[PDB]
């Protein structure tokens, strides 16, 4: 579980970062209209 817990936590961080990047891209795409 030790390796499993570290593994799952690092995975969660990874796709949280990926989701943040995608949200940034979506926000810029949406807000380009208001530019």
């Amino acid at each position: 579980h030790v390796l499993i817990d570290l593994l799952n936590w690092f995975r969660t961080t990874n796709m949280n970062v990926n989701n943040c990047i995608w949200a940034l891209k979506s926000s810029l795409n949406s807000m380009t209209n208001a530019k």
């Binding site: 990047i21 940034l24 380009t32 530019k35």
Partner: protein, 52 residues
Amino acid sequence: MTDRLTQLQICLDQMTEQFCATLNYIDKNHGVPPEEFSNTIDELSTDIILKT
């Protein structure tokens, strides 16, 4: 001649585009060598200051 209000709109649009490009570069480049990244960001920040 170009009216200065149209120039102001062009300037603000260019400023918005420059911020979008700078943040896109930051998002897609964070992680490129640190020295080249820092130099490019210094150039971008100088561009921000000049546009201001």
